Write a protein that binds this ligand. Structure first.
Ligand code: PRF
Ligand code: MG
Lengths: 99, 79, 1337
DNA sequence: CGTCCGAAGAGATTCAGAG
DNA sequence: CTCTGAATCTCTTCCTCGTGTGGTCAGGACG
RNA sequence: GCAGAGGUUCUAGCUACACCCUCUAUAAAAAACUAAGGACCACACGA
């Protein structure tokens, strides 16, 4: 048995380090993502990929919303994507988010 | 407590839209100060919204018309 | 915010623009004060502050000073989170090349300069000289010179000759190269080139040049001159274990590069000897190579226990990089994990959840409600109240848990039913209880299996986990329209024991009032569960529209059946609960309830069935004992007789009558017969053994043996497993596959000998080892299938097309494997299919075929219905609703949005786990016979010998339904005329399978046309026929003159007057192949059909499915004709046997080089058509596609995949395979450019070329001719137009390099590229939002 | 106190020998 | 006699989660 | 922190997303506000 609502974040800023020794969250692997995509699941996918795992401006906002009464959500953008962008940019390849 | 939502999806065949149109009602009853139109049977806002949809009291058109009426009242309030 | 991600090639100016400083010192931190280094990798003025709103020198950290730059330390007071956003740059002393572009699949810089990769490798690492700007001397600009050769050339002429060494030479060469001039020159040479060998390289080079001139890139940007660095936070170096403070693989590489650069600068300013400077340049280049991609050159920088260092490239690709470990499969919060438990008291829509787990999963809601109700004031007070576990906390938790679904999830979630929603029911244990009925869809097991509990949070999530994922809404499986909640083990046994009959039990013949009286009588004890009585029962029938008519009658049935009637709802009739009620009966009962009634009563019916089954299985006390396993009494006699037969066969072997193989086969056969007899005896002694006194003479009854009750009902165990417990085990197999002669003649009830146990261990170990890798293979196949069909969302409603595949019942030749009533249901008619009666439109043009419509087609005996298929859709970027068909899990037309790609991928991936990893044509019934493309020529004997070799025997009954289909080869001796009512059980075509007779189309006389005796004609004494026969040797077997004189049989007269084939003026010639026993000697009268010659003549598991989906060429592809023409031997098999196949009017002489060892089925004078087998073998899918069409390939691949799947027993609807096939053939090569911008050799997307062709056809211009291509799923997915979805599948480096060079821009719009980004996927409930966003744009 | 010191197939290649 | 089909040579990939244990690195003087 | 300063407490508590209070030279009267380091490799086991 191991249930954790919240815990210390990783270097990538993903909140669940994993395991029982250090409070962790069960990995929502690609297979579960595909299983959600098979249904009409779209909002739960967003809320399990951005506001639940790694969004420094989303997790605190949703915590404050939850402890206040309304269960809304601010999408934001995953920190791991910014980490990927920086890693690719450090490789001599210019990748940007065009508008 | 709504166990099966088949009666609710009769109103909206798409089913994906049914979730979207009930989220608005649930937010209106949770965040906004709108009383439910069905007898509140000690159920949460989501189940109340689904039950309201089943009876035919809440859909996209009716909710949009109510929002338009609220907008008109706001216009009257602001002179 | 952003709408698309754009990739490109980084410029030195852009690299400096990104940088916020200039890293110079190869240090990290001080191991005394632990402070950011002055100009090291871990700095503060270059990258950012270490502590929030505080300077390094700790001076004026007001926090109102942000944006102020403290001059004491040099840092600017800002937020700490800026240390993971800003970067720095290193100024390389000498230019260094990028390994990702130099050493890749196409060698970008090698392709650009048209220089071999070896020479560039040599010059780049300071080994050889390339002399840029050659001049008037002998050597040119791109000449390669050796070191001593360079010295000699320099001593010879000291003019503008410039032999450079190092990456500077490559930089100068790239700068000097003018792209446009090379573009026109390469195009001119492409025009000049005649063949395709040079044309391939020409096209690739011109494509690279055009890509470079199109996007905003420069050819000299590939050589890095300023190296950027990762933000310092991203490389942590903070283990803090015992003060070590040293765990960065990336940091070591950066320090290496910096140190090499600094040493090179020092040597350059010190004017060191050229050799030393060049060695340091080599070291710098090696360091940069290791930093970018370690292990690509051939060596690996290491030292940490001799383990390779992790470079930047290793942090992006693979299964551990930040592309498949942190971007797709993000770990989530609000999750739990525990073991499972049964908990039968639960309903269908709820599940157990431990209190201690729920109090931590739902903590924020508890805090919120505690604050709202006023129990606590601050979040700290609520926290303390929660940790104290006070009584009020539990009451609050019982309120925040009332209607909050949770997503229970197993680990290997293959299909969509893996993660299902459930309402929580709070329990006091430590395990999440799972409803027994839903333990089948999960593949759930109770031997310690672990599940994960996730918690939806938002209102949309809670509504969705109620209207899309609750267990009540998932009744029918997405793949096959069969129920997914099926009673499995205990409930079926209880129902079977409940609904049986005994010939004489207490309470027989009593006239029971009703089911209430039956229950009262059983509970009291005056009667027994199973005893035939007469009880009136009110059966409600819904024959009237929405009206339930009551029919009360005295039906003859047992007490147990009468008790079960209360559970059954009103609508269903009574015949459902009057049978033995095994397992298929219960499943059919549930299905009929779901059909006649709605979904709402079905859930209650299932729950009541489970409860009653559990209760009346507990009341039964069904137990297994040793006395239950009854050994047949005749076993010893059968074994003794089998041993006697074995001894007799051994005696025959000793006498030499039979051979070793014959003896082995006979022993195997007699042992198999003995096994069959033993099994039959065992069954006859178990199924009806009970004899009971029926008020007089004893009467036989179906037995009540516990093993037989557990096997007949279907609870657990088939007939073979019962056989292994009482009868002989059987003939076990040796590891290689040979069946061991001596079988295991001992059951499991009796003792098993040591040798017998070893032989059993063989097979057991084989099975376990096979499964161990079956799992991984199925996982990989499922992943590939998902990644190939991720972007398929039903966008439009009606395609509007008029084409479609032709669905017909499939008959292998023995019987109809799949009737038309199953391959048409759930699909929309492509056109107006009419009944056999002419001018009688039965089904309209566009109608969904519901069960009633399918029945109408069966009643009229239609056996050919045109059906719209997803491979024939024309809507670009997504199929339409009508083309797809039925939802297959809901029963209505598919709603706009449901992702039919992932669903089908999982549906073809989930069954893969259980799939294994390793003459006289007879007639069944009476009906007419058919022959297509028949060369009927009756011989003198009076038999229908047919020259046609690819014709079929389609037996059509009086009703028109094709009962069976066969095939007859060249010169097949028939027995019945075409279109004649044949008899039953006879052989329609009794031809000899071994021989290949060459018959005479026309009679007359025999002439030896190109058959001079001895060389090809060999009249050796043939004692087989009692007369010297002119056996034609094989093409290579005969002499050189035999090949020179191709064996041909002309038809002539007594005076050599050549007689022609009726229809063609040329004389009839029979080009006999090799090993052909020709009988009629030259100058002998022949008959019109007399046989001249006589020629006596893959895995199907998971690898078969993988090979089918990947379109892998077989070992020996079937050589097919590319055009319809007359075959003619080009030469005498000189090295490669040629075959000139030229048409009658068509002049194109298509020639194919057939290997000599390959069997050539074609003649040398026949006329093959496009798509005719010339060399027998497996048919390659590419050839089928390019020859027949897309519909034919689809019908081939779907049929083959279904044949593989049908053998094991699993059922998958064909549309799931069809969408994958459609996702395969997405590419099309342009044949004629037309008036469009497309070039000639260019793989363009089919949708794009179709759109361009439509646009051109709208005005007065011609379109573009294409040719559909079939790529493998592992290759089609890698050739998409998005560089962020292909990079997530395989070969990240290659995809990234190819995208960067071309400067592509992914416009998202996919179903995985939005998962990576982190926004609404445009498949599910986000479809409306995404379409609104598109409307806004 | 820093400072310097197997397998299985695919691509990606040549080699080639005959007509 | 130059590119046919036929070898020849490097390259990439190989389920999916838990429960855990142990081992863990660059480079020591030096002015 | 109304700006500057100090702050009950319920680690630390003008930024981490933060937030509030009283006060006029410097601390002291008061309640309501929020979750910090995780680099790699071998071995064993479960569905
Ligand atoms: N984070 C601000 C802070 C420190 N101490 C405090 N004491 C009280 N009463 N209020 C506050 O807001 C603070
Ligand atoms: Mg299990």
């Amino acid at each position: 048995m191991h249930a954790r609502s919240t815990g210390s974040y990783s270097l990538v800023t993903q909140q669940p380090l994993g395991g029982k020794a250090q409070f962790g969250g069960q990995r929502f692997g690609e297979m579960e993502v595909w299983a959600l995509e098979a249904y009409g699941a779209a909002y739960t996918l967003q809320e399990m990929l951005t506001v639940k795992s790694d969004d420094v401006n989303g997790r605190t906002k949703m915590y404050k919303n939850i402890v206040d009464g309304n269960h809304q959500m601010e999408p934001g953008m995953p920190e791991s994507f910014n980490v990927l962008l920086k890693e690719i940019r450090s490789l001599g390849i210019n990748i940007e988010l065009e508008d | 407590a709504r166990v099966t939502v088949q009666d609710a999806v009769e109103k909206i065949g798409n089913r994906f839209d049914l979730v979207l149109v009930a989220a608005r009602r649930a937010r209106q009853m949770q965040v906004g100060g709108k009383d439910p139109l069905v007898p509140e049977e000690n159920d949460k806002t989501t189940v109340i919204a689904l039950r309201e949809i089943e009876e035919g009291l809440i859909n996209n058109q009716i909710l949009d018309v109510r929002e338009r009426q609220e907008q008109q009242e706001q216009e009257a309030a602001e002179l | 915010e952003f709408d698309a991600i754009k990739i490109a090639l980084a410029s030195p100016d852009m690299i400096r623009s990104w940088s916020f400083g200039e890293v110079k010192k190869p240090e990290t931190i001080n191991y005394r004060t632990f402070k950011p280094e002055r100009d090291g990798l871990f700095c503060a003025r270059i990258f950012g502050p270490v502590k929030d709103y505080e300077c390094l020198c700790g001076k004026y950290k007001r926090l109102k000073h942000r944006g102020v730059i403290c001059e004491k330390c040099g840092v600017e007071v800002t937020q700490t989170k800026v240390r993971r956003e800003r970067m720095g740059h290193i100024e390389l002393a000498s230019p260094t090349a990028h390994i990702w572009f130099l050493k890749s699949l196409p060698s970008r810089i090698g392709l650009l300069l048209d220089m071999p990769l070896r020479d560039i490798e040599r010059v780049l690492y300071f080994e050889s000289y390339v002399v840029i700007e050659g001049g008037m001397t002998n050597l040119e600009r791109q000449q390669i010179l050796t070191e001593e050769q360079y010295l000699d050339a320099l001593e010879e002429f000291g003019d503008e000759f410039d032999a450079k060494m190092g990456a500077e030479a490559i930089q100068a060469l790239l700068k000097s190269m003018d792209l446009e001039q090379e573009c026109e020159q390469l195009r001119e040479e492409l025009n000049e080139t005649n063949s395709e060998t040079k044309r391939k390289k020409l096209t690739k080079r011109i494509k690279l040049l055009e890509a470079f001139v199109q996007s905003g890139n420069k050819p000299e940007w590939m050589i890095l001159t300023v190296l950027p660095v990762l933000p310092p936070d991203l490389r942590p170096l903070v283990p803090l274990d015992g003060g070590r403070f040293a765990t960065s693989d990336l940091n070591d590489l950066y320090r290496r590069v910096i140190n090499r650069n600094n040493r090179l600068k020092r040597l350059l300013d010190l004017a060191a000897p050229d050799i030393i400077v060049r060695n340091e340049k080599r070291m710098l280049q090696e360091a940069v190579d290791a930093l970018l991609d370690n292990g690509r050159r051939g060596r690996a920088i290491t030292g940490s226990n001799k383990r390779p260092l992790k470079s930047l490239a290793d942090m992006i690709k693979g299964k551990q990089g930040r592309f498949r470990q942190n971007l797709l499969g993000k770990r989530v919060d609000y999750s739990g994990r525990s073991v499972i438990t049964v908990g039968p008291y639960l309903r269908l829509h709820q599940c157990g959840l431990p209190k201690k787990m729920a109090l931590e999963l739902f903590k924020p809601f508890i805090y919120g409600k505690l604050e709202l109700r006023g129990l606590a004031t601050t979040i700290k007070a609520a926290k303390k109240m929660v940790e104290r576990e006070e009584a009020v906390v539990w009451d609050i938790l019982d309120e925040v848990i009332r209607e909050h679904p949770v997503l229970l999830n197993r680990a290997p979630t293959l299909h969509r039913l893996g993660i299902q929603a459930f309402e929580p029911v709070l329990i006091e244990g430590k395990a999440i209880q799972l409803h027994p009925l839903v333990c089948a869809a999960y593949n759930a097991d109770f031997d310690g299996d672990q599940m994960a509990v996730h918690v939806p949070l938002t209102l949309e999530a809670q509504l969705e986990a109620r209207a899309l994922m609750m267990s009540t809404n998932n009744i029918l499986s997405p793949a096959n329209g069969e129920p997914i909640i099926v009673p499995s083990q205990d409930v079926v046994l209880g129902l079977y024991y409940m609904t049986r009959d005994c010939v004489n039990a207490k309470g027989e013949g009593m006239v029971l009032t009703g089911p209430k009286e039956a229950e009262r009588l059983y509970r009291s004890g005056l009667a027994s569960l199973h005893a035939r009585v007469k009880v009136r029962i009110t059966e409600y029938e819904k024959d009237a529209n929405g009206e339930l008519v009551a029919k009360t009658s005295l039906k003859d049935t047992t007490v147990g059946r009468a008790i079960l009637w209360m559970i059954v709802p009103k609508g269903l009739p009574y015949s459902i609960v009057n049978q033995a009620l095994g397992k298929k009966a219960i499943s059919k009962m549930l299905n009929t309830c779901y059909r006649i009634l709605g979904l709402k009563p079905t859930v209650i019916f299932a729950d009541q069935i489970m409860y009653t089954g559990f209760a009346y299985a507990a009341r039964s006390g069904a137990s297994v004992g040793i006395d239950d396993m009854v050994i047949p009494e005749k076993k010893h006699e059968i074994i003794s007789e089998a041993e006697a037969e074995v001894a007799e066969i051994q005696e025959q072997f000793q006498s030499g009558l039979v051979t070793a193989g014959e003896r082995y086969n006979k022993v195997i056969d007699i042992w198999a017969a003995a096994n069959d007899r033993v099994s039959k005896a065992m069954m006859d002694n178990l199924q009806t053994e009970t004899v009971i006194n029926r008020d007089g003479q004893e009467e036989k009854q179906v037995s009540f043996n516990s093993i037989y009750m557990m096997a007949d009902s279907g609870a657990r165990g088939s007939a073979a497993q019962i056989r292994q417990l009482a009868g002989m085990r059987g003939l076990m197999a040796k590891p290689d596959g040979s069946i061991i002669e001596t079988p295991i003649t001992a059951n499991f009830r009796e003792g098993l000998n040591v040798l017998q146990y070893f032989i059993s261990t063989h097979g057991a170990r084989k099975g376990l080892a096979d499964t161990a890798l079956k799992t991984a293979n199925s996982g990989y196949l499922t992943r590939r299938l998902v990644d190939v069909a991720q972007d398929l969302v039903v966008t439009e409603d009606d395609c509007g097309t008029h084409e479609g595949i032709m669905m017909t019942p499939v008959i292998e030749g023995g019987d109809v494997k799949e009737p038309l009533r199953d391959r048409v249901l759930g699909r929309v008619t492509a056109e107006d299919v009419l009944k056999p009666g002419t001018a009688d439109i039965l089904v309209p043009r566009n109608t969904l075929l519901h069960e009633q419509w399918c029945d109408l087609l069966e009643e009229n005996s239609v056996d050919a219905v045109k059906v719209r298929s997803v491979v024939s859709c024309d809507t670009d970027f997504g199929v339409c609703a009508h083309c797809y068909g039925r939802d297959l899990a809901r029963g209505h037309i598919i709603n706009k949005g449901e992702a039919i790609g992932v669903i089908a991928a999982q549906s073809i991936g989930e069954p893969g786990t259980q799939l294994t990893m390793r003459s006289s044509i007879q007639v069944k019934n009476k009906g007419s016979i058919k022959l297509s493309n028949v060369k009927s020529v009756v011989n003198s004997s009076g038999k229908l010998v047919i020259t046609s070799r690819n014709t079929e025997l389609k037996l059509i009954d009086e009703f028109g339904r094709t009962k069976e289909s066969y095939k007859v080869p060249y010169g097949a001796v028939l027995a019945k005329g075409d279109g004649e009512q044949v008899a039953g059980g006879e052989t329609v075509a009794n031809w000899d399978p071994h021989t290949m007779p060459v018959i005479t189309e026309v009679s007359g006389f025999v002439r030896f046309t190109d058959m001079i005796d001895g060389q090809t004609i060999t009249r050796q004494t043939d004692e087989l026929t009692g007369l010297s026969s002119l056996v034609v040797l094989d093409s290579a077997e005969r002499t050189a003159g035999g090949k020179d004189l191709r064996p041909a049989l002309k038809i002539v007269d007594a005076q050599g007057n050549d007689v022609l084939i009726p229809g063609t003026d040329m004389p009839a010639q029979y080009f006999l192949p090799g090993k052909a026993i020709v009988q009629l000697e030259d100058g002998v009268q022949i008959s019109s059909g007399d046989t001249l010659a006589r020629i006596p003549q893959i895995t199907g598991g998971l690898p078969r499915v993988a090979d089918l989906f990947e379109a892998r060429r077989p070992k020996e592809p079937a050589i097919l004709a590319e055009i319809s023409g007359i075959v003619s031997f080009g030469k005498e098999t000189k090295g490669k046997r040629r075959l000139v196949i030229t048409p009658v009017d068509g002049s194109d002489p298509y020639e194919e080089m057939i290997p000599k060892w390959r069997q050539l089925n074609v003649f040398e004078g026949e006329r093959v058509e496009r798509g005719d087998v010339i060399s027998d073998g497996p048919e390659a899918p590419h050839d089928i596609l390019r020859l027949r069409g897309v519909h034919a390939v689809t019908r081939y691949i779907v049929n083959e995949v279904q044949d593989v799947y049908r053998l094991q027993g699993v059922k998958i609807n064909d549309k799931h395979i069809e969408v994958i096939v459609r996702q395969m053939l997405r590419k099309a090569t342009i044949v004629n450019a037309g008036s469009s911008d497309f070039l000639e050799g260019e793989q363009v997307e089919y949708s794009r070329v179709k759109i361009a062709n439509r646009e051109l056809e709208a005005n007065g211009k011609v379109g573009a001719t294409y040719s559909r291509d079939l790529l493998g799923i592992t290759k089609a997915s890698l050739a998409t137009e998005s560089f962020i979805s292909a990079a997530s599948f395989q070969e990240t480096t290659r995809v990234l390099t190819e995208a960067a060079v071309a400067g592509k821009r992914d416009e998202l719009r996919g179903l995985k590229e939005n998962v990576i980004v982190g926004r609404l996927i445009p498949a599910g409930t986000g479809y409306a939002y995404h379409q609104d966003r598109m409307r806004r744009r």
